[PDB]
């Protein structure tokens, strides 16, 4: 009856056609992370940053965008393990939710949520954000910002995550780059507490003994077959 914690990154959603939040060369595809993924960027040019996330939010909800087999396999794994399963994602898309996962910890926030920039309260939000969209949680309504964690900000749900990490029998990292901390350090924390560690990725992130078990290839192929193997090892 093992406890399983799964961490996912941008690699699992790549095959779904998602404009990516994988940082490469300081770029998020064609935008400077410094400009649209930092608190300073939002302070320097909020109208641009709101437009960048408005565009991402729209693209996320286009009909061609669907959870892929890897998303579905994790939903099956949660079905089989119940409270013994926790999914933590660095992704701000909702493809895990659409797949059927519940209680997903979005450590970097969610594209389909916005946040009151003073209260910090988040709320579901599917449309554009305009300068006249303001909070309802405060005495003087304040501007709303994307509920996406930027580089330089503290990730969400870390107490819950580290608790689960200390308890996990199996830790699986899927589609993560190994460049973004503290997420990339979770494997180390998992191994310090005796978990069996697994990497499922398109390319190797780390080099060494820190993932005990590793399989590489497209997420839609490698992930369902690891999960299906794991699910048959319970029976």
């Amino acid at each position: 009856k093992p406890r399983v914690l799964v961490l996912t990154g941008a690699g699992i959603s790549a095959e779904s056609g998602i404009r990516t939040f994988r940082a490469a060369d300081g770029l998020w595809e064609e935008h400077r992370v410094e400009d649209v993924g930092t608190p300073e960027g939002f302070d320097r040019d909020p109208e641009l940053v709101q437009a960048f996330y408005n565009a991402r939010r729209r693209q996320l909800q286009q009909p061609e965008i669907q959870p892929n087999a890897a998303h579905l396999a994790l939903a099956k794994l949660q079905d089989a393990l119940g409270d013994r399963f926790l999914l933590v994602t660095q992704n701000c898309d909702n493809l895990h939710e659409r797949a059927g996962n519940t209680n997903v910890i979005h450590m970097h926030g969610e594209l389909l949520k916005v946040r009151c920039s003073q209260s910090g309260q988040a709320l579901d939000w599917t449309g554009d954000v305009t300068p006249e969209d303001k909070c309802h949680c405060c005495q003087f309504p304040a501007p709303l910002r994307p509920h996406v964690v930027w580089f330089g900000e503290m990730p969400l749900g870390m107490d819950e995550i580290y608790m689960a990490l200390s308890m996990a029998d199996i830790f699986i990292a899927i589609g993560t780059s190994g460049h973004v901390y503290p997420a990339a350090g979770f494997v180390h924390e998992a191994k310090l507490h005796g978990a069996h560690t697994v990497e499922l990725n398109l390319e190797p992130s780390q080099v060494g003994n820190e993932f005990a078990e590793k399989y590489y290839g497209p997420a839609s192929q490698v992930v369902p077959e690891f999960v299906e193997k794991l699910l048959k090892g319970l029976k």
Partner: peptide
């Protein structure tokens, strides 16, 4: 674990 950071 600190803030969200690269490298």
């Amino acid at each position: 674990g600190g803030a969200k950071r690269h490298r």
